[PDB]
């Protein structure tokens, strides 16, 4: 039965059971992964409004002189650009990217995007052929399995990621593991099926418009806001739209239990519904840099191209 | 059918005979690369484009009897497992050389049958791609999308037009989004006959999804031999970027005064929707991974077309 969220932990909502997993509102959970930062700045003035508590250590500044600031005089070089490229009504989906040098950091990536009056800034550390490569062995690929192999094949290779699956939802949202490339020795997922509640059907509209999400340590404490309600609005702050997000604690424990260190998954989106995963696991954390994962959110819309086209030749 | 080639002593093509040219076997590439055939089992070089010394800085004679395996002997088994025998003339696979002659090149291979066609080019060494995938996805409507592929086009490659021309079911063209220097003519809202790119043109770009021409003034330099020893037939070079462009379209681009000219197909359904389409006034090379942006671009215009016709229908 579909009902709707419960209000966080934080708001003084329940702990989340078995019982009521469609409820948990996993786009707000007040927190981050540590391996990255987030600033929260209102939409037209550019004033810093929330950060995430580790953010001295990222940008190596003190919380009372970041929050002081505008990012007009934070990040003088971006601040126009994200104002051009991120207009006010736009899109949460959106996002502009940027690379800084920053004193203390080294090179950080910026990932912007809004969510009404708010810009969400999420920094990151970041770092031949492989990509056009793999267009072309995708395109020619014979049928839907032959695709499927090729481009778990390709992903692995690319990452180093000890499994990639591709997991096909069936229409009762139960899913498949269609095809996978496994390191040795890992026994074997393919043609195992799973009960549509493993993923929950707010987990899977979200994922319909937010097209990657990454565990990089199953077992990190989450880092949380400060403040932990926008100030605008005094209201949760939606993350939906941060690949930074903390992941959902059911889910964290749904892993280590599998002995998975690290969880990335990309959608492949078909006609407007959420067709499959391109579902990866390490059994170590391990952090996959910007620009790499960049490479696979690439390869996600190759792939719902390909998925369209190999089905259609298909009746 | 078509005519033979001119070099076979077929007829030269007029106003009368759009249809017949055979622009995929010209027997020649364009002047800014060098192009190689080969043996597909032995690695052996059968054609080479009479220009090759130039870019491979290597003696005439030397290469025409070598092996790939010895030419380029870390490449030669990629090539092997890359295109295995039987796979499709679309396939390709690249890679850049550090070369001694020429700091570094860019390598282009596919196969058609038993031959393998090697492209050369020069080559070099962000975000603008990730940032326009995004902007992409999160146009509004067909209009929207059109407007934003033209000027992303643009600004990725400095072209002084880039279009949108999509086809109707006659395959009459009209230019739909236009992004362009100040002091063009505009071409939006125009419409042209089907016979402009003319049915065997639009066929070969349903399969092969970039084509141009780098300078509507340079010559072609032809093949050596022209005819491949294997068949003693034309060597098919329709998927080669670098195959010579037919004149009759080169006249035409002139007579627009433009220097240079670059499209991608955007294919939906298994059929030709539409091109990017862009114009420069004078001669101009883009280079291989700028080239590659758009290629990756056109995919994704392909996907994006579908969604957004699909939320009018
Ligand atoms: C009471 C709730 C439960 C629950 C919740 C839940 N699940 C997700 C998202 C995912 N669940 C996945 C499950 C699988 N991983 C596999 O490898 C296989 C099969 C071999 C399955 C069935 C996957 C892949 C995802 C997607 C994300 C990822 O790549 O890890 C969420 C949302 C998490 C978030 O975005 O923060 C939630 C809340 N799963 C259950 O089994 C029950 C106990
Ligand atoms: C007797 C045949 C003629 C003919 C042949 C022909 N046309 C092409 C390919 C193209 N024609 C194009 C025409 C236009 N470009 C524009 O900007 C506009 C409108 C403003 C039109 C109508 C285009 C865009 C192409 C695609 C190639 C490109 O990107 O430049 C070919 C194929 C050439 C080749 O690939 O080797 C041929 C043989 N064109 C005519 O107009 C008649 C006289």
């Given at each position: 039965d579909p009902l709707p969220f419960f209000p966080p932990l934080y708001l003084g909502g329940p702990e989340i059971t078995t019982e009521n997993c469609?409820?948990?509102?996993?786009?707000?959970?007040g927190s981050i992964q540590p391996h990255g930062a987030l600033l929260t700045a209102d939409?037209?003035?550019?004033?810093?409004?929330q950060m995430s508590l580790n953010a001295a250590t990222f940008l190596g500044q003190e919380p009372t002189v970041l929050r002081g600031q505008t990012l007009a005089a934070l990040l003088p070089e971006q601040w126009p650009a994200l104002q051009a490229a991120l207009?006010?009504?736009?899109?949460?989906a959106l996002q502009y990217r940027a690379t800084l040098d920053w004193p203390a950091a080294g090179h950080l990536s910026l990932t912007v995007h809004r969510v009404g009056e708010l810009l969400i800034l999420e920094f990151e550390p970041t770092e031949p052929h492989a990509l056009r490569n793999a267009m072309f062995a995708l395109e020619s690929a014979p049928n839907l399995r032959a695709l499927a192999e090729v481009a778990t094949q390709t992903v692995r290779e690319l990452t180093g990621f000890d499994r990639v699956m591709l997991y096909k939802f069936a229409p009762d949202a139960t899913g498949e593991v269609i095809a996978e490339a496994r390191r040795e020795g890992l026994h074997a997922f393919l043609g195992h099926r799973f009960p549509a509640?493993?993923?929950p059907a707010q987990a899977r509209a979200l994922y319909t418009r937010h097209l990657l999400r990454l565990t990089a340590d199953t077992r990190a404490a989450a880092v949380p806001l400060?403040?932990?309600?926008?100030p605008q609005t005094n209201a949760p702050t939606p993350l939906?739209?941060?690949?930074?997000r903390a992941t959902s604690p059911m889910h964290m424990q749904y892993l280590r239990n599998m002995g998975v260190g690290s969880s990335l998954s990309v959608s492949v989106v078909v006609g407007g519904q959420l067709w499959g995963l391109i579902a990866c696991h390490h059994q170590t954390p391990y952090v996959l840099p910007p620009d790499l994962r960049t490479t696979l959110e690439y390869l996600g819309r190759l792939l719902s191209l390909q998925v369209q086209v190999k089905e259609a030749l298909e009746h």
């Open positions: 469609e409820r948990e509102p996993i786009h707000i959970p939409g037209h003035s550019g004033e810093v409004l207009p006010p009504g736009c899109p949460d509640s493993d993923i400060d403040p932990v309600l926008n939906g739209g941060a690949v930074l």
